[PDB]
Design a protein around this ligand. Structure first.
Ligand SMILES: *[C@@H]1O[C@H](CO)[C@@H](O[C@@H]2O[C@H](CO)[C@@H](O[C@@H]3O[C@H](CO[C@H]4O[C@H](CO)[C@@H](O)[C@H](O)[C@@H]4O)[C@@H](O)[C@H](O[C@H]4O[C@H](CO)[C@@H](O)[C@H](O)[C@@H]4O)[C@@H]3O)[C@H](O)[C@H]2NC(C)=O)[C@H](O)[C@H]1NC(C)=O
Ligand SMILES: *[C@@H]1O[C@H](CO)[C@@H](O[C@@H]2O[C@H](CO)[C@@H](O[C@@H]3O[C@H](CO[C@H]4O[C@H](CO)[C@@H](O)[C@H](O)[C@@H]4O)[C@@H](O)[C@H](O[C@H]4O[C@H](CO)[C@@H](O)[C@H](O)[C@@H]4O)[C@@H]3O)[C@H](O)[C@H]2NC(C)=O)[C@H](O)[C@H]1NC(C)=O
Ligand SMILES: *[C@@H]1O[C@H](CO)[C@@H](O[C@@H]2O[C@H](CO)[C@@H](O[C@@H]3O[C@H](CO)[C@@H](O)[C@H](O)[C@@H]3O)[C@H](O)[C@H]2NC(C)=O)[C@H](O)[C@H]1NC(C)=O
Ligand SMILES: [Ca+2]
Ligand SMILES: [Cu+]
Ligand SMILES: [Zn+2]
Length: 1256
């Protein structure tokens, strides 16, 4: 279970289409006149690429054979749970490369990423491997790394070079990582399976390492235009697909397979919705021999390199209805806005819907699908308002047959064919009319009729885990683009067996600049068909109707009844190209057996959602996408009939905001939600520790289910703003009609919201203890989120949220809002003249919670301790962020529980995930969209061990006098005395000033878990601090009050009751600081203090390695000699800090500076110091005055711990009883440590502990 891999970063030439340039393996030396050149050319081009390649051995002589199909893709690495991977990378390239694995565990020596991690330079070799050199890596695959019960037998992850994502990805450094549960060795029937990693990578050769612009290749495994070789699957079997998206900007890919459906998680999906670091395991099953096009389907034919062939080949060894429809393609005049709702117009509405100089406006002639009653087509079946434009609803359960008698009646040859059903032959015959490869592209003529037999089979239908019905569609296919654009579209449900089937919602941009009838419309509808323009980009874009069903800017109003439990069948077929993030106001539909709140839809995609109309009111169905919705895509919902109360006091207030100064400061006016204490919005409930991380985000508003939520919201701020969530449930008040729920807080006004929390606002029994929902202003959805109004609304479950904290407390919880603020769109944008004197790209910030560039504070988490992450993205389509917890994996839950390593955040979606932190240290949260990352979208978190409490040296004098500092001194009662247990005379700090403080500079950032506190006696009175508060700072003039564990304005700590006693307050969101400062607030007679500071370094390596705690068996301790006589035995074994009794320490058989004491940790350890002691014996005292230190990995090679030049000589031990620490400040690794005493007193005699932690 130690899997060894020998990757190397190799450069090669690549033209993308020519397979077998990968004969690197073999000097394929071309002779004639040659048409290449590792730069460009023309007759085929040839690009500089650096990819991952495998090797036979640890000496990189012979490269592996790589398959036809892998292309650029690195070697796939596989591991079961509990194995260990040990990769050796050898860089053989122009540029440097790292190896950063996703979805396994590693040790920071192995993380292959570099950032401000407080990491020894040895643990930073991994971070960048230079040309030549090597680096072994080692990955862990722990139990929390592996798949769940519901997961595939083997999770699809990846690994890449992580030195310059934009460069590294765009140049070919990306391979597959397969983390399977234990049983990567079961005899799969290796006729099916086959299994093919499917990199869906866009490469921007105009910004790979090699480049300067140039072009950007949408590829599959690095091949363009159907050229990928080798994708063969066996016939009546099934093939798995480990799918990895890649790209260094946004962009999504809607991936299809001509005759086929994908099964993922456990759902029948038609396309694969993928986008930068999306990871899937899809499986498909092959019933039809032949060759089928795998391809991305985005209208933008540029999206049109993602096209590869799959060949499938023989290998070796009650009663179902028949539904009948008479349907006609036939032309009509179509009105996009037949409902008098004009007035609203300082907003676009005019442009798309007016007549004159060069606008058709709103009445375009189109062709539709129209249902008739019989073969005569002289009479129409029942139309129905609300589904306008879209053809007749075509239902069909698994097993049924649909007879689509089709008659044309138009002015071009059309056609009708369903995407969804595999088995669609002609009726009666099984053979096609002419040289017709496929019924799909075969047209229907004059007014001919064709008779089709669509048969719905099982493999078309749902899958237990998805809904009773699933949403498809039909359309003419003689010319998909312009036919659909002319309006040939209609809905097709496909369902399961044992006010009926209800609303169909079609999100459709009809580009009337492509509709066959563009010309016909121009003649009839223009002032002078003379004014041609056609590419006058206003006229052109004036016929790009952003439609819902067939209506726009709110003409589709649709009535439901209060508590009508209604299904919604939802499609995105149009020009479109980008995903849609669809929402209903005030409402919450059920998606994957989970209540969500926005529903993201890729092009040519359809989903079923299901909701109960519990919110009386007028609502808008719509788009959430910024600048659609503006362009018409709206629609209306008109409903109408036919234990605690957790009160939060919240206001929208303005501030300045730099999203982070540090490292490189313009400041920006924003407006944000903050919590206040009183109705009298005057006590602003300042936050810290538990909420420092909130950033630009509103406060956590938390309810359980069935209690009530009450937000009093007061608008400060210049503009009017709103508190909306979509959990906000208005009651069946105000009759007379449906009413748009007011909302809208005018400045200074103070509106109040109250609503009970329904089981449907809360976790399914299969979700986590606590669900997250967003809330924001909605007076201008787009403009005033960018301004800054946004927050998390946790809805906890059952009896989970409790205490007097109103919070889980069982689990550490954080909220992360990823988005790219455009201060050009933020209201206060003109007030941000204040700069000095033409592109905006410095007015945009890629900011987690409003901090950019590892600047977001507040992320500290205990060692082993569940952590729940609410992840939100918002905004423009660009915001498809791909969030990674480096070195960690988490679990997402929707009806079942799946392990993941990168969550693919789509705007408007608010997922909740839980992880446990394996490894202590400082770790990174990225967005692996490389552009986003390098624009700052990153931060870090700290996981600490709760078991690394140690005295920071305050009593022990390790803290030198000069670091203690106060403010007044009484006299001779100096702060250099504040040292716990100090004795005599004057023996503490003391000040007669009321307002005072004492301050300790630890000299570097540290983790503090507590403070032990005394105070002395002066003759017969007792002096002590009975009540203090703690301030801390990171730089030294950035103090913040330790509002520890929220509690109130601040944490007031209880000091002492007397001289003697120690009071051991603890910091339970521990303090990360280097200056801590204690402010006496109540003292007896005099503020007076001896104190000790409990704490730890940042990486939690301060605890002993088990010398005193016999955890280092006497066999691991060994020395060069050891004096023994008859009554003595000063054997190494005994050289343990504080050991007592006879012969209690190590003594070399003779004293000389060549002797040494040695410790074999067995494993590699991170030694960060050495405490060291001497001994009293035979009432004659011996100890080691000076020493130096050697270290080793093998036990036969050695290096002395140099420092600042010339071999460190450590102080250590002036007496035979006092232990003395000696931190190693370029901290040692190695498994071997030797102590070399140089100068002593009477006799060399050593007792010690070693300080550090485990490594490797
Ligand atoms: C995979 O798919 C198809 C094959 O089915 C090919 O797609 C087209 O290939 C042709 C060449 O065979 C391209 O035509 C020429 O492209 C030149 C490069 O400019 C491109 O790059 C920029 C980068 O931003 C694009 O924005 C731009 O639109 C171009 O696509 C042009 O210089 C050529 O311009 C012509 O018109 C100008 C204007 O007067 C003249 O000055 C020129 O001399 C020339 O006559 C020309 O357009 C075509 O662009 C490709 N289409 C697309 C969508 O890229 C792929 O090449 C094929 N193979 C791959 C991808 O490797
Ligand atoms: C405000 O300050 C308080 C204290 O001042 C903090 O409260 C406790 O803080 C820590 C974590 O920050 C917790 O203390 C202990 O947690 C340990 C976790 O180990 C258990 O965790 C797993 C979860 O996977 C359990 O399944 C398993 O039992 C592990 O042992 C344990 O040492 C203790 O947990 C268990 O102890 C007994 C078992 O005999 C049970 O009865 C307990 O209910 C619990 O299951 C121990 O609890 C603790 O979780 C915090 N809460 C407490 C003590 O109520 C706050 O966290 C802090 N507020 C913040 C940070 O917001
Ligand atoms: C809000 O508006 C007022 C100024 O118009 C300022 O606070 C308010 O100051 C007035 C001064 O007398 C106080 O009287 C009250 O005014 C409110 C209008 O907000 C009115 O409804 C009451 O009946 C009463 O006459 C008032 O106490 C005080 N407002 C509050 C809420 O205490 C202030 O400049 C403005 N800004 C904010 C943030 O309140
Ligand atoms: Ca590292
Ligand atoms: Cu991102
Ligand atoms: Zn694409």
């Amino acid at each position: 279970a130690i899997r060894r891999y020998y990757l190397g970063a190799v450069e090669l030439s690549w033209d993308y289409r020519q397979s077998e340039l990968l004969r690197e393996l073999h000097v394929d030396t071309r002779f004639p006149a040659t048409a290449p050149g590792a730069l460009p050319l023309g007759p085929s081009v040839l690009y500089k690429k650096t990819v991952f390649v495998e090797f036979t051995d640890q000496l990189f002589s012979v490269a592996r054979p790589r398959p036809p199909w892998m292309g650029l893709l690195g070697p796939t690495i596989q591991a079961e749970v509990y194995d260990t991977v040990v990769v050796t990378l050898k860089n053989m390239a122009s540029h440097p490369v790292s190896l950063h694995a996703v979805g396994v565990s590693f040790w920071k020596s192995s993380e292959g990423a570099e950032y401000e991690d407080h990491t020894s330079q040895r643990e930073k070799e991994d971070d960048k491997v230079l040309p030549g050199k090597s680096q072994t890596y080692v990955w862990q695959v722990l139990k929390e790394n592996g798949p769940t019960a519901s997961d595939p037998p083997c999770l699809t992850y990846s690994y890449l070079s992580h030195v310059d994502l934009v460069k590294d990805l765009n140049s070919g450094l990306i391979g597959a990582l397969l983390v399977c549960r234990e049983g990567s060795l079961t005899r799969e029937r290796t006729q099916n399976l086959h299994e093919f990693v499917l990199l869906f990578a866009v490469f921007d050769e105009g910004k790979s390492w090699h480049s300067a612009a140039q072009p950007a290749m949408h590829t599959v495994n690095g091949y363009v235009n159907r050229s990928l070789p080798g994708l063969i699957g066996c016939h009546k079997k099934s093939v798995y697909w480990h799918v990895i998206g890649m790209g260094t900007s946004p962009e999504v890919h809607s991936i299809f397979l001509e005759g086929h459906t994908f099964l993922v998680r456990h759902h029948r999906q038609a396309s694969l919705e993928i986008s930068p670091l999306t990871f899937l395991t899809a499986q498909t099953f092959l019933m039809d021999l032949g060759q089928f096009l795998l391809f991305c389907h985005i209208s933008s034919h540029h999206h049109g390199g993602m096209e590869a062939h799959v060949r499938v080949e023989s290998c070796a060894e009650k009663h179902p209805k028949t539904w009948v429809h008479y349907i006609a393609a036939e032309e009509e005049d179509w009105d996009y806005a037949p409902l008098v709702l004009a007035p609203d117009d300082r907003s676009y509405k005019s442009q798309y819907l007016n007549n004159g100089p060069q606008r058709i406006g709103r009445k375009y002639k189109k062709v539709r699908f129209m249902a008739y009653t019989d073969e005569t087509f002289k009479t129409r079946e029942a139309i129905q308002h609300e589904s306008g434009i879209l053809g007749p609803l075509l239902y069909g359960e698994v097993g049924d047959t649909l007879l689509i008698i089709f008659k044309n009646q138009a002015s071009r040859p059309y056609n009708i064919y369903p995407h969804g059903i595999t088995d669609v032959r002609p009726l009666y015959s099984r053979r096609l009319p002419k040289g017709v490869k496929h019924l799909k592209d075969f047209p229907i003529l004059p007014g001919e009729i064709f008779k089709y037999k669509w048969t719905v089979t099982v493999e078309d239908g749902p899958t237990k885990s998805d809904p009773r019905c699933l949403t498809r569609y039909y359309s003419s296919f003689v010319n998909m683009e312009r036919d659909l654009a002319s309006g040939l579209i209609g809905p097709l449900l496909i369902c399961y067996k044992e006010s009926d089937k209800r609303n169909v919602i079609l999100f459709s941009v009809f580009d009337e600049n492509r509709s066959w009838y563009l010309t016909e419309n121009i003649q009839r509808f223009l002032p002078n068909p003379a004014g041609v323009q056609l590419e006058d980009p206003e006229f052109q874009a004036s016929n790009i109707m952003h439609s819902i069903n067939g209506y726009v800017f709110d003409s589709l109003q649709l009535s439901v009844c209060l508590h009508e439990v209604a299904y919604w069948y939802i499609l995105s077929i149009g020009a479109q190209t980008d995903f849609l993030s669809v929402f209903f106001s005030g409402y919450t539909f059920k998606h994957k057996m989970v209540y969500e709140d926005t529903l993201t839809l890729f092009p040519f995609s359809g989903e079923t959602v299901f909701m109960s109309m519990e919110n009386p009111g007028l609502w808008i169905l719509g788009c959430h996408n910024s600048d659609f919705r503006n362009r018409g895509m709206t629609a209306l919902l008109k409903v109408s009939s036919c234990k605690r109360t957790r009160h939060y006091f919240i206001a929208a207030v303005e501030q300045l905001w730099d999203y982070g100064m540090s490292e490189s400061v313009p400041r920006f006016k924003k407006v944000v939600f903050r919590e206040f204490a009183d109705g009298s919005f005057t006590q602003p409930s300042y936050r810290g520790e538990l909420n420092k991380h909130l950033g630009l985000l509103g406060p956590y508003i938390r309810a359980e289910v069935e209690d009530n939520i009450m937000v009093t919201f007061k608008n400060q701020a210049s503009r009017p703003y709103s508190f909306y969530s979509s959990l906000i449930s208005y009651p069946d008040d105000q009759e007379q009609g449906a009413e748009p729920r007011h909302n809208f807080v005018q400045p200074n006004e103070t509106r109040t919201y109250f609503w009970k929390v329904q089981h449907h606002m809360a976790p399914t029994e299969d979700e986590f203890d606590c669900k997250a929902w967003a809330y924001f202003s909605d007076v201008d959805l787009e403009k005033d989120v960018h301004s800054g109004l946004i927050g998390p609304l946790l809805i906890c479950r059952a009896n989970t949220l409790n205490a007097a904290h109103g919070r889980q407390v069982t689990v550490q919880e954080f909220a992360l809002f990823f988005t790219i603020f455009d201060e050009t769109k933020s209201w206060y944008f003109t007030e941000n003249v204040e700069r000095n004197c033409t592109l905006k790209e410095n007015y945009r910030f890629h900011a987690i919670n409003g901090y950019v560039m590892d600047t977001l504070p507040g992320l500290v988490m205990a060692q082993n301790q569940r952590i729940r992450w609410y992840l939100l993205s918002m905004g423009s389509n660009e915001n498809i962020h791909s969030i990674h917890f480096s070195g960690h994996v988490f679990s997402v839950r929707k009806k079942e529980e799946y392990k993941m390593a990168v969550y693919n955040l789509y705007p408007g979606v608010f997922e909740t995930v839980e992880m446990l932190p394996s490894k202590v240290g400082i770790w990174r949260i990225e967005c692996l969209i490389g552009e986003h990352l390098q624009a700052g979208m990153s931060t870090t978190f700290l996981v600490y061990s709760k078991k690394c409490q140690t005295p920071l040296g305050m009593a022990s004098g390790h803290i030198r006098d000069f670091q203690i500092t106060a403010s007044g001194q009484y006299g001779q009662w100096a702060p250099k005395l504040a040292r716990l247990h100090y004795s005599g005379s004057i023996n503490a700090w003391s000040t007669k000033e009321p307002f005072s403080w004492i301050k300790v500079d630890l000299l570097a950032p540290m983790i503090i878990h507590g403070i032990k506190t005394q105070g002395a006696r002066q003759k017969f009175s007792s002096l002590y601090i009975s009540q203090f508060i703690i301030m801390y700072s990171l730089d030294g003039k950035k103090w913040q009050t330790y509002r520890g564990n929220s509690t109130g304005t601040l944490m007031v700590f209880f000091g002492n009751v007397d001289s003697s006693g120690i009071k051991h307050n603890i910091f339970n969101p521990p303090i990360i600081a280097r200056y801590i400062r204690l402010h006496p607030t109540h003292y007896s007679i005099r503020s007076t203090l001896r104190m000790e500071l409990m704490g730890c370094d940042l990486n939690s390596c301060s605890m002993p390695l088990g010398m005193e705690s016999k955890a280092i068996s006497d066999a691991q301790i060994t020395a060069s000699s050891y004096f023994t006589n008859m009554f003595a035995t000063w054997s190494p074994s005994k050289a343990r800090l504080h050991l007592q009794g006879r012969s209690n320490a190590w003594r070399p058989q003779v004293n000389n500076p060549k002797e040494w004491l040695q410790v074999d940790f067995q494993k590699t350890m991170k030694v960060t110091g050495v405490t060291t002691q001497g001994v009293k014996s035979l009432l004659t005292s011996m100890y080691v005055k000076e020493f130096l230190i050697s270290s080793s990995q093998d036990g036969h090679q050695w290096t002395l711990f140099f420092q600042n030049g010339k071999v460190k000589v450590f102080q250590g031990n002036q007496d035979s009883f006092t232990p003395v620490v000696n931190s190693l400040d370029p901290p040692l690794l190695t498994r071997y440590l030797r102590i070399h005493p140089q100068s002593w007193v009477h006799q060399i005699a050593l007792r010690m502990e070693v300080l550090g932690c485990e490594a490797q």
